[PDB]
Design an enzyme around this catalytic site. Sequence first.
Site, PDB file in Angstrom:
ATOM      1  N   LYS D 164       0.822  -1.186   0.000  1.00  0.00           N
ATOM      2  CA  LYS D 164       0.000   0.000   0.000  1.00  0.00           C
ATOM      3  C   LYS D 164       0.856   1.236   0.000  1.00  0.00           C
ATOM      4  CE  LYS D 164      -2.414  -3.332   0.761  1.00  0.00           C
ATOM      5  NZ  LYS D 164      -3.338  -3.083  -0.392  1.00  0.00           N
ATOM      6  N   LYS D 190       2.889  -9.060  -2.373  1.00  0.00           N
ATOM      7  CA  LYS D 190       2.208  -8.843  -3.697  1.00  0.00           C
ATOM      8  C   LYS D 190       1.970  -7.454  -4.260  1.00  0.00           C
ATOM      9  CE  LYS D 190      -2.284 -10.421  -4.189  1.00  0.00           C
ATOM     10  NZ  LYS D 190      -3.411  -9.459  -4.184  1.00  0.00           N
ATOM     11  N   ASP D 192      -0.855  -5.166  -5.541  1.00  0.00           N
ATOM     12  CA  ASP D 192      -2.343  -5.020  -5.389  1.00  0.00           C
ATOM     13  C   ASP D 192      -2.940  -5.455  -6.703  1.00  0.00           C
ATOM     14  OD1 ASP D 192      -4.871  -4.359  -3.873  1.00  0.00           O
ATOM     15  OD2 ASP D 192      -4.044  -2.529  -3.218  1.00  0.00           O
ATOM     16  N   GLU D 193      -4.249  -5.788  -6.767  1.00  0.00           N
ATOM     17  CA  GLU D 193      -4.931  -6.089  -8.073  1.00  0.00           C
ATOM     18  C   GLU D 193      -4.744  -5.005  -9.115  1.00  0.00           C
ATOM     19  OE1 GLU D 193      -6.220  -6.061  -5.250  1.00  0.00           O
ATOM     20  OE2 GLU D 193      -8.374  -5.343  -5.073  1.00  0.00           O
ATOM     21  N   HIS D 283      -5.801 -13.404  -7.958  1.00  0.00           N
ATOM     22  CA  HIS D 283      -6.920 -12.519  -7.457  1.00  0.00           C
ATOM     23  C   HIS D 283      -8.266 -12.738  -8.169  1.00  0.00           C
ATOM     24  CE1 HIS D 283      -7.723  -9.476  -4.560  1.00  0.00           C
ATOM     25  NE2 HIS D 283      -6.405  -9.145  -4.509  1.00  0.00           N
ATOM     26  N   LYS D 323     -13.270  -7.901   6.197  1.00  0.00           N
ATOM     27  CA  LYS D 323     -13.968  -6.726   5.653  1.00  0.00           C
ATOM     28  C   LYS D 323     -14.773  -7.079   4.400  1.00  0.00           C
ATOM     29  CE  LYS D 323     -10.383  -4.943   2.615  1.00  0.00           C
ATOM     30  NZ  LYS D 323      -9.305  -3.942   2.297  1.00  0.00           N
TER      31      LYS D 323
END
Lengths: 119, 112, 227, 458, 458, 119, 123, 123
Positions: D164, D190, D192-193, D283, D323
């Site tokens: 992030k 990883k 992120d998508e 993903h 979440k």
Amino acid sequence: IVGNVFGFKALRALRLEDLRIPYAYVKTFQGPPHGIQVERDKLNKYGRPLLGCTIKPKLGLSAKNYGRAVYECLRGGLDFTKDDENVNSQPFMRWRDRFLFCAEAIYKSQAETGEIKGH
Amino acid sequence: RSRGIYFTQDWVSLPGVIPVASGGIHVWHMPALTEIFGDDSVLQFGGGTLGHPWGNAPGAVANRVALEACVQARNEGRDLAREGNAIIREACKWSPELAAACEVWKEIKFEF
Amino acid sequence: GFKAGVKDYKLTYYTPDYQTKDTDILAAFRVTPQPGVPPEEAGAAVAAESSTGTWTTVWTDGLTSLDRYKGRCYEIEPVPGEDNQFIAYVAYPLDLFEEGSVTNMFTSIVGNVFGFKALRALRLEDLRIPYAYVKTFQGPPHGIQVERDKLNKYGRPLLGCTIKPKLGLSAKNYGRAVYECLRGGLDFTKDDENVNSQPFMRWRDRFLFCAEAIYKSQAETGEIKGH
Amino acid sequence: GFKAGVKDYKLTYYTPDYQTKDTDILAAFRVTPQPGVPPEEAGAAVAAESSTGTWTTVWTDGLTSLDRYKGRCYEIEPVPGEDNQFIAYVAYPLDLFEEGSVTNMFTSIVGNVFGFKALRALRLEDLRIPYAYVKTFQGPPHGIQVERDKLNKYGRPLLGCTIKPKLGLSAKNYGRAVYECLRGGLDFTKDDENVNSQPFMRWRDRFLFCAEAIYKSQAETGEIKGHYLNATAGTCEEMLKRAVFARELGVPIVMHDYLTGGFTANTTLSHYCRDNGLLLHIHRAMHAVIDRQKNHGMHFRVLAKALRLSGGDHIHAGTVVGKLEGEREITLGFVDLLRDDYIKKDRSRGIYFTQDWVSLPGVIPVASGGIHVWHMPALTEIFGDDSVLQFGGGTLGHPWGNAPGAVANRVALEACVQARNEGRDLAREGNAIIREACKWSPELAAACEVWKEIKFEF
Amino acid sequence: GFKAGVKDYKLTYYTPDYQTKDTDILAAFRVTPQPGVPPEEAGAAVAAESSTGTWTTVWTDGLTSLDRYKGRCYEIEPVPGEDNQFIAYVAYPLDLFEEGSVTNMFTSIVGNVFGFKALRALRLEDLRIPYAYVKTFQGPPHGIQVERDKLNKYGRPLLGCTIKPKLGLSAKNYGRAVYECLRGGLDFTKDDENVNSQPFMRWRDRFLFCAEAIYKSQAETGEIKGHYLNATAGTCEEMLKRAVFARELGVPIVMHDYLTGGFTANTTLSHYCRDNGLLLHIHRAMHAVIDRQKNHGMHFRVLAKALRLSGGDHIHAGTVVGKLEGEREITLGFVDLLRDDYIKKDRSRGIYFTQDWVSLPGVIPVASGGIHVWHMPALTEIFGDDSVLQFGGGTLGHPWGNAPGAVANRVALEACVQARNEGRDLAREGNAIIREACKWSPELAAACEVWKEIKFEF
Amino acid sequence: IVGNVFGFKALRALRLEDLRIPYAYVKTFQGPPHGIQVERDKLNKYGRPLLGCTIKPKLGLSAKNYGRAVYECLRGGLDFTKDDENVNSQPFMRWRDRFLFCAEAIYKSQAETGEIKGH
Amino acid sequence: MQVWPPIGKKKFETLSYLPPLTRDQLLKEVEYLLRKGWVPCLEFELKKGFVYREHNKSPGYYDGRYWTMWKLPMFGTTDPAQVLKELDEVKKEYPRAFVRVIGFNNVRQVQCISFIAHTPESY
Amino acid sequence: MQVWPPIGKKKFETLSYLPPLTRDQLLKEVEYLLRKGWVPCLEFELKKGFVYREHNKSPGYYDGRYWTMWKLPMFGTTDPAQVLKELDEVKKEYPRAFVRVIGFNNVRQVQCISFIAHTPESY
Ligand SMILES: O=C(COP(=O)(O)O)[C@H](O)[C@H](O)COP(=O)(O)O
Ligand SMILES: O=C(COP(=O)(O)O)[C@H](O)[C@H](O)COP(=O)(O)O
Ligand SMILES: O=C(COP(=O)(O)O)[C@H](O)[C@H](O)COP(=O)(O)O
């Protein structure tokens, strides 16, 4: 030479014992990739029969166990290990995997012993 | 023709194949073997190795020594088929790897 | 727990109680065993050596699942004579085989077993190709239906003639024979098995004089022509 | 003899007497029909339009064999309410499908039918992939067993952290985060998508700073290290350009979102990764669009069977306690479908069909979604060792940073495994297993205070 | 100052005062939140999670500028009826997205934010594609302009026909059927969406027998003819093997299902289509799974824009009248978006933003689905001339067969054109231009007796 | 020869008027792919200048209308038509499209005039 | 059950699995070579005593395969005495060094035996 | 705010981040292993008890992954006792080896557990 003449209804049974290959035909062939001479000189191995071992069970070993098994056999004195004839690429164990884990093991045993190794 | 060799065969320098022996062989076969194929051969032991009581490293050692033990003896002038069973017992004395395998495959003979 | 040494084949590889699975390749061997060799054993001998087994106990069997992967002999059928010949029914699991690969399937069910000193002889009669195995195969590039559509030929058997003499003819002499053949009403001509490319006739010259001849007669007969 | 015109669907495509074949693909649609529309008809409507049929009689049906090739509806099951909702059971023959081709299988059983004005709504719940069909698929390029051998990792769940902020970081800044992460104890980092290659960060620079960072920490920890390199791309040429460079760096692993890329793009990728030795990380970016609602869509479970045959080493699987949504029982179902060789009909978890995979490799479920240190016995009880659990914020939101966020996670994971292994009940002692493992781990203890009251529960 | 801890999404993501840049990507999400999550909080949750944020605070935010990069929920429209569904306006900065790739753009905007446990349901109504992004796209291989000029066909809707039954026709019957339909008046025939390569009928065969038939009908009529050939396949090797052969066969159009095929593969397919001059038809197979419901998914509009961008000559666009769903005004809205350079906001039409295309080619919309000879004027009035009108049932079900069914539709189409041009009103005087036309075509008149009183109404 | 000298501060202005191309350097070149004599023997025209015309407007014309004017130009008696310098490939007309209409249009005004045409 | 060492057990190919060869045995191998018609040749190494790959690594390419040659192969030679004689001299100048005895067959042109004669002290 | 050290933190997969387990815990891991029908085996290494890459470098390839096998997997073991017996034993043959206790699943045919059981001393 063997295309049909063996199914011949006017016979009981046929078998091909020997074939004399002329040497002018033999010469249209590469033949062996290497021969007994080059094989020995590449590996540096002389004065004895070579030694291998076919991994068991024929089938059903997974790639990682293939290589721990090769490593084992190669290190304790064998010049060669080997896949069984049926060992090709199957669900239990896909070819590429086997190749990589087996290459590692090749080279680990080779360091271990100082002898040239071949799976 | 005594050998089932029908014609004369000339190969005009074409490389030779190393023959591979392989199939229910074990540590006791080793000298019959060396006498038959000679040096130019590949001797192959799955059962012969992956079935030693101590495992794969040893099974390897058992065969490797029992092979070697043959070589030297032939070279020293011993006869491998008349004095075969012994070059191995003498060899059982120095390898614990070997000796173990001859107790397990004591009295397996492939004969028919 | 692992014990080194020879045991009988029959103990792991003879399961007369086994229920074949739709995934199993089903082998039918006509077996002539040696004197002494019992059914169950030479039967088992067969399934072991064509699958996972070996002439002695090896320890790595412990590493994997025998039950999941061994070829079994599940039925012996007595066959007339003495002899003491019989039919031994063998089930090999799917998992043993390379997908799309006759080569892996024949190496295995027929690699070695026919060489057992412990038989007089041995014949593979029939093999149940399970469908789940079929599906891994392209098979024929067209098939019966498709060939007929492409040539437009229907309602009758088809007609070919392999050219002669099998060997010794010229490229130009070939498609001379091929043209006089095809125009008279044959659906096909062919190369004999023996002909590929030799001193008397190199293929591509053949391929050439055949094609000139494939078509000169198609347009003559109004009928699709092959060689 | 051929008569022109409209007839009911039910007459050819509703066979309550049919005996499914082991070769049949078996569809389970949760159907909400229109007012008036009878079961049998809207049922038949469904099988016709997903197979061979049409809204009128056409003559060419005479040319072929309907019996040999029509999808049939063979069972309707009443479902609680009015509504008049029901479960309609559909068998399509083998012969209808392209071999090795999720794409042909989904186009067909789900191409059109969901758009029938003649329903209110319609959901594909489950699909019995017949094994004879499985066998036409490579599936994952390695599978659960093979991944573990190659990395040499055993006995515990695996550990990842998506970096992030999702977007806006530099190539060099990325593998800064990646190195501080991997060295602290994560099996993986990883992409992120969202990250592929953008203005702020072009992929190949990323791939570079990640690899320098893959390895600087492997040799530091003595532990095999990955970072999910996303191949996911605009075009198929680019997508192949990215894993080649990967192939070429020596790197253990690559990633692709399979549904926004598409099963075609994905299958080429799972084909190349097996031929080049690459782990494949999946993903499920864009799923909840397809899967969220009870009355209309495609249950995640179809989407996870379909990934298994398209192929991939890892697939996100839900977090349960996270979440993102995903209820326990239903989640336990598709994890065994991803994983196991044979899966028995289980209605209470929502397995509507016995599923045999006859030796296809298993995909490792990836858990990941606003979870952190206290969820970890829930995670190690829910999935079992056979899982990647993954901590984005849960690692870069640890107060002392990336090597400590990563430590806090690895020990708490280890703690649960020792606790379990020793006979303790992860549903009833895990909160205390964490408390325990805090005295011994200062990094862990720090991440425990920031996140001592954060649940997500609706 | 990196403060660890969970904070409200609203603090960084909700920005009611934001002025959008002509370069952002804009989104209108129809948000139905859970009970006791305030609008603003769900809006920013949506905006952060599709952009740069996560669930707890991360320090790697400080390395870059969140201001430059973050997605912003810039408006909340409290929404009519539904309690309490609102419409959330979010702005995505250009830099977030990779050039030439729908996939990526669909990965950030819809990757996860729809599975959000803090909501009831999410749906993506509209996406405003800036024109500086649109410019990183080839788009359509050809566009409505080139398509028409290549084929020499002008002044009417185009005509096709989807071959039936969907599946189970063998290659040789495929081509006799194409030949039939193409010769009797159709501009186009076509494979069904499911038609790819199967046991009953392998692709290459179909292609050859179908190319013959193409060219036989073309001689027969003197009109330019186009059969649609499916390149849809399991792998892009296979998708590409087929267009190469279609290439070699010299034939004018191929087919791809884009949603099942998927976007990476599709934009790979369009590239080969503009590079070797193949026109390319699109099917939206599966679209209904995602766009069908009002509360949750993605409206067909959004996937209509995606297609423009990725590329495609033709895209299916619903029939309004036929058997599957799609409604006029809205259906009106999305045609100008596939077709025009410029569509102003228009909410009556479900047109959320103004969309400029900066000369990008238009898609010809394809109507198709339980239509017949009586639909023809409703049709001509809805789509206009720039459209492809598609009749499988409509043709392969005429009492006289395929050549005639073709003739029936071709005339009934024509009969419409002229009448509109002469100054007749097609929706008030529709049923008549056909009866007057039944008088001169025995082909037509036959078809109106058979589909006398079939109306697709729900 | 023209790399930096035009930028010297000590200069107000320098122009390269001519360059003696020594014959030794000429030879490392192929130069024109066919040249005057060879063009003329391919196209089979002698005795006059050739005739051409650039398609107008410069930019803005579509792949069809380009080819429509390309036919109307050649047939009435031009040896050549031609893209304007700025015609390349654009959102108003992509190249693979011009190329393909323009080729119908060259051969058609060929079979019509019996003179060889190009564009 | 004896675990075989994974270090301290480096090998030298044909004969190194037996006990080291006594002078009655290093003689008896030399006789065989001569009784068979081979030519004997002595070689030696002072550096890396086993196989490695420094300069290339493609298949069947190895390094450390060659040693240095002691003088000339022994054309002329009938007595096995005169061989070990050379072995004595090569130890006597390179005691920190691997020495091998080889013999050629000139028709086939291969090495037909080869066996270690001398090592350093440990390796 | 504490710094996790960039040296001297060499790890060994599962458990290696926990405090070293007592024999009570070591026997406890074995009991779990036997209780789920897995089969224990001991591995060890003397040169190179971490992964590197020397002999090729392509995706998926690493050296150091295999150690040496201590005898044989313990088929037919029932009493977690017997595992420690062998563990102590390797320690006596090689005090300065690295030793792992590994449990085989035979159906799945992968290692279901693998935790380090002895380090040497210095590195
Ligand atoms: O697989 C084995 C048996 O192994 P082992 O007996 O060593 O278990 C064989 O060696 C060869 O494949 C048989 O072929 P052939 O009869 O030519 O050797
Ligand atoms: O980006 C995140 C959140 O990161 P974190 O919670 O680690 O900050 C997740 O890894 C996926 O987006 C979850 O989606 P799915 O259910 O498809 O895995
Ligand atoms: O296959 C058919 C039905 O054919 P017919 O009704 O002509 O038998 C459809 O036209 C499209 O595939 C449906 O997709 P969409 O709903 O976008 O058109």
